[PDB]
């Protein structure tokens, strides 16, 4: 019932009471742990699944109850009157609207409960842009551009989420088909390999399939593909002036820059579903700033990504004959030193994995005292390099699902009717 | 029910039907995941929890069932008579003895089932030494020495395990107090600094208290502390000629040797409990060979261990002033390069993390093919550096508990009833 977590490097023990509020399910049972499945059913929301009048009210009450608790006015007339108001409106309309205040609290808290996110110490500083009055793709494009500009802030990045109208009958969905607002194109060849980013090959083709003339570079910023109100989606190019990029160079190896690598500054996840008080915001792109490893370990070095390790090791003149020389490892460290140094040099916000994990531990400790715990997913929180020399490695974490939340949702192209 | 696991680097999908044979429990529920908890309730065995006839026979039946399928004799006359024999023996004596074959099979399986072990490709080559005739500590010391010598094999290491008598009434336990058979002393100093291995401080105090005269150096092999038949434990120095050690140097850095580091060649875990057919074998040391990171990342570089990163980064004159310089990540790699280099030079078996994880992926796929699954703990299988440039990071894994199995048990010094 009450539950301990131990840091094995510091012997600190924290008691968890927050988990007993867990409203959603994990994927696990007494018989099988699923802690390392990317996408259990539970973590996804399929669009067929429209909320019914009966399921919606419980969800609303629970949400409004925590809302009114947070502003220390639990069980007050304003609490009670709101609960009735929303009640009535469900009874009549079969949905309800959130007050701005609730929208903002809802968004901040979905981030707060993102148990896979290492960056949550920052959860309370989110800028929320209410785009609920949007009606078209053009509108969405305008909203996104404003989001991007505000977030980038000349390199001094600021967290933001833009919130498009909530799902209704699931026929009128707003969606951003892009998985991130800013990503590079991926192209195959007759040759057979890949040019640019292999992660985006399909999506890159879906855009070309829609009229995108592609400049066919290794770093073509993909067009936004936007869908308002269940309509066919539309292509739009983000003004390059709004897309901050960093050329990647090494603080010690001047040959580094000769590979002509760069990366974009703004990580802005776009494909997720934001759920507040049973309401579904299926388009809610959000952004903050990069932990260095997301670019350097994963984006460059994952086999099925830019896979530059082989290339970097060669220029480093390391013994690539045998795994046991740790050449892959050696190179991985330099590549990451480079990314951090470039961003830092161009005064664009970035955090190293040592620092982020330190902050997250402070954050857990804060959440244990003030809230009674902090849901956390060790498989995702531990960074993908130097795992055990970061303090999160030695930290037991409890993972459970609280609401409001971000959830995954199927790729729109498998679901949309034309 | 069928269950699917995806590998996100290769899109290989596998199907687990084996989880359906899973008896024990995880710690998780529909509403919590305890997958990152180190010692959950269910992964441990308190010695006060000694089994009744009541619960024993199903566990015995289950196990003998598994045993006779593996040798293709399910429902054999030999199978039924063994069932009735064991049954008669349980009602009569309240326990029962494993045949040699069953001990051998049980032990391989515990290993095969060890979901936190990346070494498992090797599970079928385990030398099992049956020490079920041992009645004393001195008997224990003698057995362990033969294990160490045989497993060491002049640097060409061989998996082995030594199995001492099972629990009876939980008052007569055999136990190896050591957590590993070979380990370096740790000494807290009055100024608060530690000399030798910080992991081992407590155990070192117990030893010193039990009579050990401590050389008090940075790398002193601790004596064995051994309990037989529930008796107070006794002390023994492994003969040094039996302890293979490898001085640590770096292929390119000549100053590295001057850090004065060395490590022992044989990883040999001695504190776990072996559960076979409901039977409990509370001293059962087993040994293998090292994955480099186990010394190079954890043993030297954990803040809570020899913590040599500072000194190695110093000597590389790295920019240690900001973390964002990755001086820790850089020092970590060099140290690990050094560890693999020293072991290979001296022809002491060792495996690097890339090579071990690749093997484990092949093992795992084969285990799905022919066994119907492979229980795996991702949190433990992924290496402690360079996670995502090894293929296990991208591998979805089902974790669940099968018997036979290796369990944790509480530290003997916490539970033992002193004879004085
Ligand atoms: C401010 C800097 C931030 C940093 C450094 C950061 C860091 C991370 C990292 C490393 C991950 C792991 C995912 C991966 O490897 O691709 C992650 C996941 C995530 N973060 Fe953040 N984060 C930040 C801000 C945000 C913001 C603003 C939100 C939303 C408001 C957010 C919500 C999430 C969610 C939902 C996930 C995981 C989705 C899932 O699988 O369930 N984070 N974060
Ligand atoms: C062949 C050489 C072997 C290698 C390279 C190897 C590798 C490993 C590693 C790296 C771990 C994780 C431990 C840690 O990081 O602290 C581990 C766990 C384990 N291995 Fe091995 N292993 C080997 C042989 C064996 C043998 C012979 C056995 C028993 C017969 C065994 C049983 C285990 C068990 C039971 C655990 C996990 C303990 C737990 O439940 O928490 N392994 N192995
Ligand atoms: C706002 C934000 C900031 C940041 N630094 N990093 C992120 C990335 O976090 C997410 C959040 C949700 C999904 C996701 O993508 C999953 C893919 C799967 C393969 N590896 C990582 C990317 C990544 C977001
Ligand atoms: C036979 C063998 C070979 C090998 N290479 N590595 C191992 C390591 O296996 C274990 C098996 C059980 C416990 C354990 O360590 C547990 C604690 C927790 C943190 N690490 C060290 C002590 C390590 C065994
Ligand atoms: C199979 C495994 O669950 C998958 O590769 C996960 C593991 N941990 C991760 N952790 C982070 N931060 N990001 C990821 O994409 C993944 N991938
Ligand atoms: C809290 C966490 O479970 C703990 O630090 C675990 C994580 N993964 C590990 N993995 C291995 N191989 N060895 C370990 O000791 C640990 N420690
Ligand atoms: Zn779990």
Q: Which domains does chain B have, with CATH numbers?
A: 16-132+159-169+273-287+357-381 (3.90.340.10), 133-158+173-244+408-412 (3.90.440.10), 245-267+290-355 (3.90.1230.10)
Question: Chains A and B: how many Cβ contacts under 8 Å?
Answer: 204
Count of Cβ atoms closer than 10 Å to residue B346 Cβ: 14
What is the Å distance from ligand 4's center to B121 Cα? 16
Nearest partner of B166 among B93, B215, B237, judged by Cα = B93
Q: Which residue does chain B place closest to A350, by CA atoms? A: B324
C-alpha dihedral over A31, A36, A37, A40, to 10 degrees? 70
Distance (Å) of CA B76 to CA B59, B68, B100: 19, 8, 19
Three-state secondary structure of A29-82: CCCCECCCCCCCHHHECCCCCCCCHHHHHHHHHHHHHHHHHHCCCCCCHHHHHH
List strand residue ranges (DSSP E) for B254-382, in order.
262-264, 268-269, 273-276, 279-281, 286-287
Nearest partner of A335 among B10, B386, B339, judged by Cα = B386
* A299 neighbors A179 (Cβ within 8 angstroms): no
Q: Which of B22, B333, B344 sits opposite A333 (nearest CB)?
A: B333
For chain A, the straight-line distance linking the first and the last C-alpha, in angstroms and rounded, comes to: 50
What is the Å distance from ligand 4's center to B269 Cα? 6
List strand residue ranges (DSSP E) for A215-304, in order.
224-227, 234-236, 245-247, 262-264, 268-269, 273-276, 279-281, 286-287, 290-291
- Which residue has the CA at smallest separation from atom 14 of ligand 5? A380
What is the Å distance from ligand 7's center to A296 Cα? 29
The DSSP call for residue B205 is: H
Quote the minimal CA–CA distance from A97 to chain B in Å.
29
CB < 8 Å to A1, chain B: none
Burial B397-407 (b: 16+ CB within 10 A, else e): bbbbbbbbbbb
Going by C-beta distance under 8 Å and a sequence separation of 6 or more, which residues neighbour residue A239?
A: A145
Helices (H), B114-220: 137-152, 201-209
Distance (Å, whole) CA B181 – CA A142:
67
Quote the minimal CA–CA distance from A12 to chain B in Å.
13
Peptide bond into B404 cis (omega under 30): yes
The DSSP call for residue B372 is: S
Ligand 2 within 6 A of CB of B288: yes
Going by C-beta distance under 8 Å and a sequence separation of 6 or more, which residues neighbour residue A27?
A: A34, A37, A40, A41, A42, A43, B33
A289 flagged as catalytic: yes
Distance (Å, whole) CA B182 – CA B246:
13
Pairing assessment for the beta strands B160-163 and B127-130 based on DSSP bridges: parallel
Pairing assessment for the beta strands A262-264 and A245-247 based on DSSP bridges: antiparallel
Distance (Å, whole) CA A201 – CA A50:
31
Measuring from each residue's beta carbon to the nearest atom of ligand 1, which residues come in under 6 Å? Answer: A 111, 114, 116-119, 122, 126, 159, 161, 286, 288-289, 291, 294, 351, 356, 380, 406
Q: Most B CBs within 10 Å: which of A3, A316, A329, as the mutation test of the B interface? A: A329
Going by C-beta distance under 8 Å and a sequence separation of 6 or more, which residues neighbour residue B85?
A: none
Distance (Å, whole) CA A275 – CA A266:
24
* B32 neighbors A22 (Cβ within 8 angstroms): yes
Report phi then psi at A168, rounded to 5.
-125, -90
| B390 phi-psi bin (left φ>0, alpha ψ -120 to 50, beta other) | beta
Q: Is B300 annotated as a binding residue?
A: no
Helix (H) or strand (E) holding B187: strand B186-188
- Largest Cα–Cα distance in chain B? 74
Three-state secondary structure of B93-122: HCCCCCCHHHHHHHHHHHHHHCCCCCCHHH
Ligand 6 within 6 A of CB of B97: no
Distance (Å, whole) CA A163 – CA A281:
7
Going by C-beta distance under 8 Å and a sequence separation of 6 or more, which residues neighbour residue B206?
A: B177, B225, B413
Distance (Å, whole) CA B122 – CA B107:
13
Going by C-beta distance under 8 Å and a sequence separation of 6 or more, which residues neighbour residue B132?
A: B97, B103, B163, B164, B165, B166
CA A132 to chain centre: 21
Distance (Å, whole) CA A143 – CA B91:
77
Q: What sign does the dihedral B146-B152-B154-B158 (CA atoms) show? A: positive
Beta bridge partners of B339: none
Nearest partner of A172 among A280, A57, A55, judged by Cα = A280
Place of tokens 């830092």: A344
Query: At CA A166, angle to CA A163 and CA A168, rounded to 5?
Result: 165
Distance (Å) of CA A222 to CA A145, A177, A240, A414, B351: 14, 11, 11, 20, 43
Q: Which residue does chain B place closest to A23, by CA atoms? A: B31
Count of Cβ atoms closer than 10 Å to residue A325 Cβ: 18
Q: Is B94 annotated as a binding residue?
A: no
Distance (Å) of CA B367 to CA A299, B6, B18: 31, 15, 10
Please judge whether A35 and B384 are an interchain contact, meaning their C-beta atoms are less than 8 angstroms apart: no
A117 flagged as catalytic: yes
What 3-state class would DSSP assign to A276? strand
CA B170 to chain centre: 23
Distance (Å, whole) CA A354 – CA A300:
19
What 3-state class would DSSP assign to B366? helix
Q: Which of A31, A352, A384 sits opposite B387 (nearest CB)?
A: A384
CB < 8 Å to B388, chain A: 297-298, 301-302, 384-385
Nearest partner of A227 among A95, A128, A135, judged by Cα = A135
Query: At CA A266, angle to CA A264 and CA A268, rounded to 5?
Result: 125
How many CA atoms are closer than 13 Å to the CA of A90, on its beta-carbon side? Answer: 21
What 3-state class would DSSP assign to B86? helix
Helices (H) and strands (E) in chain B, counts: 12, 16
* B206 neighbors B112 (Cβ within 8 angstroms): no
Mutate to test the pocket of ligand 1, among A153, A288, A409 (most ligand atoms within 8 A of CB): A288
Count of Cβ atoms closer than 10 Å to residue B61 Cβ: 15
Which technique? Answer: X-ray
Tokens of B377: 């703990």
Rg (CA), chain B: 23
Distance (Å, whole) CA A298 – CA A107:
27
Ligand 2 within 6 A of CB of B351: yes
Q: Is B51 exposed, middle or buried (0-12, 13-18, 19+ CB in 10 A)?
A: middle
Helices (H), A72-229: 77-93, 100-112, 137-152, 201-208
A120 flagged as catalytic: yes
* A304 neighbors A199 (Cβ within 8 angstroms): yes
């Amino acid at each position: 019932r009450f539950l301990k977590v131990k840091n094995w490097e510091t012997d600190v023990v924290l008691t968890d009471t927050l988990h007993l509020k867990s409203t959603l399910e994990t994927g696990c049972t007494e018989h099988i742990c699923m802690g390392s499945i990317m996408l259990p059913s539970q973590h996804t929301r399929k669009p067929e699944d429209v909320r019914t009048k009966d399921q919606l009210f419980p969800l609303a009450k629970e949400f409004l109850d925590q809302y009114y608790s947070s502003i220390k006015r639990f069980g007050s007339k304003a609490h009670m009157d709101r609960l009735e108001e929303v009640n009535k409106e469900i009874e009549s309309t079969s949905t309800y609207q959130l007050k701005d205040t609730e929208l903002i609290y809802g968004a901040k808290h979905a981030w707060r409960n993102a148990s896979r996110c290492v960056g949550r110490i920052q959860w309370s500083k989110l800028q929320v842009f209410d785009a609920r009055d949007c009606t078209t793709a053009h509108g969405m494009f305008n909203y996104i551009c404003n989001h991007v500009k505000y977030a980038t802030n000349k390199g001094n990045l600021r967290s933001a989420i833009t919130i498009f109208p909530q799902r209704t009958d699931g026929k009128h969905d707003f969606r951003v088909w892009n998985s991130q607002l800013i990503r590079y194109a991926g192209y195959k060849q007759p040759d057979g390999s890949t040019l640019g980013d292999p992660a985006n090959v399909q999506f890159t083709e879906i855009c070309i399939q829609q009229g995108w003339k592609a400049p066919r570079g290794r770093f073509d910023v993909l067009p936004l593909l936007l869908q308002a109100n269940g309509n066919d989606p539309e292509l739009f190019q983000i003004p390059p002036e709004l897309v901050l990029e960093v050329p990647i160079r090494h603080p010690k190896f001047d040959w580094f820059k000769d590979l002509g690598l760069k990366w974009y500054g703004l990580p802005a996840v776009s494909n997720m579903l934001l759920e507040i008080g049973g309401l579904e915001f299926s388009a809610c792109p959000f952004s903050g700033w990069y932990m260095g490893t997301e670019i350097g370990v994963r984006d460059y070095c994952d086999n099925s990504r830019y896979n530059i390790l082989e290339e970097v090791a060669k220029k480093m003149d390391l013994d690539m004959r045998k795994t046991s020389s740790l050449w892959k490892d050696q190179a991985l460290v330099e590549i990451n030193i480079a990314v951090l140094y470039s961003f830092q040099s161009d005064k664009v916000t970035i955090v190293d994995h040592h620092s982020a994990t330190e902050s997250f531990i402070k954050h857990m400790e804060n959440e244990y005292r003030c809230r009674g715990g902090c849901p956390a997913d060790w498989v995702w929180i531990v960074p993908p390099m130097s795992g055990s020399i970061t303090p999160v490695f030695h930290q037991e974490m409890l993972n459970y699902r609280l609401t409001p939340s971000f959830e995954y949702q199927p790729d729109p192209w498998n679901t949309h009717v034309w």
